[PDB]
């Protein structure tokens, strides 16, 4: 009977000392399921995060990690048409990805064209989508609106970077060194403020001639999105998205004594908020920008096969990592 490579984690902890490599009997397919063996996935930050039980209360043990990557349809349930046997498509919102097959809903599978390459497929989910939502959605930037993003060296800050190009607006990156500075330039930042060398508050007064930014975007929280928060105008937007620090902003001072408007954002949570028609749209749009090279991911950092996710983690964990994605490859 078929088996199925598997990560498993059955205790939060450290990835080290919790990833597990298995294998499953794989269960016959529910009628609107769709089956696909993994080509690629990407080790993000943010697929970590749940290993370690910061989310205990909502992410069953045991579990697999994984919320994205790129594979091939192999079956498909009673209800789903048989034509997307053989299709390369993102799997998404179903199963955890980093194992040798990926189940989940019809509805949630993303096709993919033949121009885009496994890798880049691989980075389309997670990060576009986050930045494209909150640009257009849940900031609604307008033209020449001004953005600050902060952690702007990830992954997430370089397509912030390309999007104030795509959509007008004008992006001031937030940086803790100069690591990605020029690449940041490159792709479309008006500014990059390193803040191991510029006062963040001050130059975003300089550069918006004491008026403060329109929006913000807070991966790190704590002191730095306080000072984030404060380099806002009056009834400017305040968005959190990560929380590197571990630490929660100053919420209250945030909205009485700076006059910000402050929300935390969530894909979990717009995710739900959205049809099925719309998510699906909302990728066909994001393929447009690829295929048009408006918008272009990290270039691959290394490759690793399921088994050795281990060793890979502990590079994506690794200080002096340098640039790019880890993957997790099935070829």
């Known amino acids: 009977s078929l088996h199925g490579k598997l990560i498993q984690f059955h205790k939060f902890g450290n990835p080290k000392d919790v990833l597990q490599v298995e294998y499953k009997n794989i269960e016959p397919l529910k009628d609107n399921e769709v089956f696909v063996r993994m080509l ?7 697929d970590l995060i749940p290993i370690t039980g910061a989310y205990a209360h909502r ?57 885009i390459d496994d890798f880049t497929a691989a980075q389309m989910y997670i990060n576009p989508l986050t930045a494209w939502v909150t640009c257009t959605e849940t900031l609604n930037l307008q033209r020449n609106d001004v953005l600050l993003v902060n952690a702007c060296g990830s992954a997430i800050g370089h397509l912030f970077a390309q999007l104030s190009q795509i959509l ?15 690449e940041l330039l490159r792709l479309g930042a008006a500014y990059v403020i390193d803040t191991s060398t510029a006062p963040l508050y001050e130059t975003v007064m300089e550069l918006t001639n004491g008026i403060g930014a329109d929006a913000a975007i807070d991966s790190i929280g704590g002191p730095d999105g306080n000072e ?18 571990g630490i929660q902003v100053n919420w209250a001072e945030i909205v009485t004594k700076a006059k910000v408007h402050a929300n935390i954002f969530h894909l979990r949570h717009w995710n739900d908020e959205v049809s099925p028609y719309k998510w699906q749209e909302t990728f066909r749009h994001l393929i447009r920008l690829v295929e048009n090279e408006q918008l272009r991911f990290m270039k691959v950092h290394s490759t690793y096969e399921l088994a050795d996710v ?15 994605k880890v993957f997790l490859t099935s070829y």
Not at 40 to 46: E, K, L, Y
Not at 168 to 182: D, G
Not at 230 to 245: A, D, E, K, V, Y
């Open 40 to 46: 690629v996935r990407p080790i993000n930050p943010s």
């Open 59 to 115: 992410i069953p043990l045991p579990n697999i990690p994984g919320y994205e990557g790129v594979g091939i349809v192999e079956n498909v349930g009673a209800f789903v048409s048989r034509e997307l046997i053989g299709k390369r498509v993102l799997p998404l919102r179903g199963e955890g990805t980093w194992q040798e097959y990926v189940k989940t809903s019809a509805d949630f599978v993303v096709p993919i064209p033949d121009s």
């Open 168 to 182: 007008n607006f004008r992006l001031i990156a937030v940086t803790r060194n100069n690591k990605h500075t020029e």
């Open 228 to 245: 984030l928060a404060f380099s806002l105008r009056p009834n400017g937007h305040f968005l959190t998205i990560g929380l590197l620090s």
């Open 310 to 324: 281990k060793a890979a983690v502990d590079v994506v964990q690794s200080a002096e990592k340098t640039k790019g």
